[PDB]
Write an enzyme that holds these catalytic residues in place. Structure first.
Site: not given
Ligand SMILES: O=C1C[C@H](NC(=O)[C@@H]2CCOc3ccc(Cl)cc32)CCN1
Ligand SMILES: O=C1C[C@H](NC(=O)[C@@H]2CCOc3ccc(Cl)cc32)CCN1
Lengths: 304, 304
Positions: B41, B143, B145
């Site tokens: 992503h 950030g 990820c």
């Molecule tokens: O653990 C985290 C990560 C998080 N960011 C995500 O979850 C992204 C954006 C939202 O929509 C999604 C949807 C799917 C995926 Cl794979 C990623 C994401 C921000 C806060 N903390």
């Protein structure tokens, strides 16, 4: 989101760990520049520890009696000296992995990461607090002495603790990197009173702000209190008195959440008086005091 | 003595962290040999995440669109490919700090250390468990990820997790290093049910053995139970059923303490039925399930 008892990344400290042997005693040392720092009781046998005369014991030791090993390579010891309860072994090679560093003497209630080591090898890292009674509740086995506590600000490692002993109560005592014990402890195998431990009130409040930021809000109430009223409750529950300095340090968290520090104190007061009633806060059934206000801001803002 | 939620020393993993940018999205990557692994992503904008077609999005990207930075130096990307939910960026330089490593797909209930990173920079390390429902309760901000989970056996790092997302419930989901999600999660910004989480019974028993070794024994009782009787209680309290495989893995701890696994089960049964009555076990007011039997043996024996 989510809140964890996070330690600093330990890499910069792993590169400093060495094994120090003197006679039949082996423990960990910290190699920074051309100096290896370790607990002075490395020169003692088990029998010596009951009542050691460190000046007399050290006089029977020469540079060649201190065996310092960094991984698989042996360091050449060209000087030795005692500074309070630490030995400083001058070696002929500067540690190529020496990070930018400082030696700091932390205050009670402050937190730090510990890199537990055995035979100069790192086994684990955990976060803890220097208790108000200057003990730490660590995880240390035989051979862990010389393991260090530290904080990291970007590229600079501030070493604040060196492990020396475990009290008969199971808690741990140690020194700063100048070899001065935190607390009234001496490096002798004798019964040593740690003194009454109290809960670090400012840290519990900081953790309550972390809980609100991360979604756990059930404990927020319609009440407020004063510093004096709150401290009457804190005294009864062996919590350290909250001062205006503590309120000032909670300022950023009070600003981010919009919850006045004294309103958070009233939530804490009600939790102290009524308990959690079988509920949890950030996955804990007790009031957590090992996160400073700085730790909460750092973890909630992702400082690297 | 003392028992802490200890993470592995993170140095070997810190040396692998890099920053990956694609368009306006930046996250962490893992540089091992001449390959950088990151969540696919990274090619999405915030708008794309609602319903991404990763094959179509990736077709609009070339090697030069993937910006990989290791500290201050830029890596040259010579290949790119998608494997499940991860991108593998082939670079022209092998990571000189690549430790001995393996990619492993851990089982639910197993534990691992997480090195939380932002912009390819490590901010903290903590220990957690892969929940029975294949989520992790982490501490991750925007950030984070691409931050990875791992275990370390002496010199070998077994990478088991790569962070991808936070569910609307605040728990975290991610993949193994082949890009296969743990659990039923997909890398889309849509409502995703994690499913009922259960307590990792074998881990709670292991932690109860850790408590006995470290001196906390108030919970030991004059009772015993059977696997079937214990499991009737476990089902009622959303504990995972205990099997003879779990009993076998507790064998070393049962041997060290002299407390039969079924007698420890009867202590656990009484704790589940009666609570702690305001008491603590290893500084916790709840039954801890993030220590496997292996973790308890390792921490109690000082494996480096
Ligand atoms: O653990 C985290 C990560 C998080 N960011 C995500 O979850 C992204 C954006 C939202 O929509 C999604 C949807 C799917 C995926 Cl794979 C990623 C994401 C921000 C806060 N903390
Ligand atoms: O945290 C630890 C360390 C501990 N070893 C000591 O405490 C030594 C031996 C006992 O007598 C003493 C007495 C004083 C000093 Cl400084 C050290 C010592 C072993 C278990 N875990």
């Amino acid at each position: 989101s989510g809140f964890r008892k996070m330690a600093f990344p330990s890499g910069k400290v792993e590169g400093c760990m060495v094994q120090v042997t003197c006679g039949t005693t082996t423990l960990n040392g910290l190699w920074l520049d051309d100096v290896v720092y370790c607990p002075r009781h490395v020169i003692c046998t088990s029998e010596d520890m009951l009542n050691p005369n460190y000046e007399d014991l050290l006089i029977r030791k020469s540079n060649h009696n201190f065996l310092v090993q960094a991984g698989n390579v042996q360091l050449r010891v060209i000087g030795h000296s005692m500074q309070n309860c630490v030995l400083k072994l001058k070696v002929d090679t500067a540690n190529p992995k020496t990070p930018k560093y400082k030696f700091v003497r932390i205050q009670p209630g402050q937190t730090f990461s510990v890199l537990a080591c055995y035979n100069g090898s790192p086994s684990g890292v955990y976060q803890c607090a220097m208790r108000p009674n200057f003990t730490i509740k660590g995880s240390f086995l035989n051979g862990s002495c010389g393991s260090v506590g530290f904080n990291i600000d970007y590229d600079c490692v501030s070493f604040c603790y060196m492990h020396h002993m475990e009290l008969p109560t199971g808690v741990h005592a140690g020194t700063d990197l100048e070899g001065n014990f935190y607390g009234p402890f001496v490096d002798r195998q004798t019964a040593q009173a740690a003194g009454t431990d109290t809960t670090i009130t400012v840290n519990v409040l900081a953790w309550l702000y972390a809980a609100v930021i991360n979604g756990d809000r059930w404990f927020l109430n319609r009440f407020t209190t004063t510093l004096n009223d709150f401290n009457l409750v804190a005294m009864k529950y062996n919590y350290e008195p909250l001062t205006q300095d503590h309120v000032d340090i909670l300022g950023p968290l009070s600003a981010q959440t919009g919850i006045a520090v004294l309103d958070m104190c009233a939530s804490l007061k009600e939790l102290l008086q009524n308990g959690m009633n079988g509920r949890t806060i950030l996955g804990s059934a007790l009031l957590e005091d090992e996160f400073t206000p700085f730790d909460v801001v750092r973890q909630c803002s992702g400082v690297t």
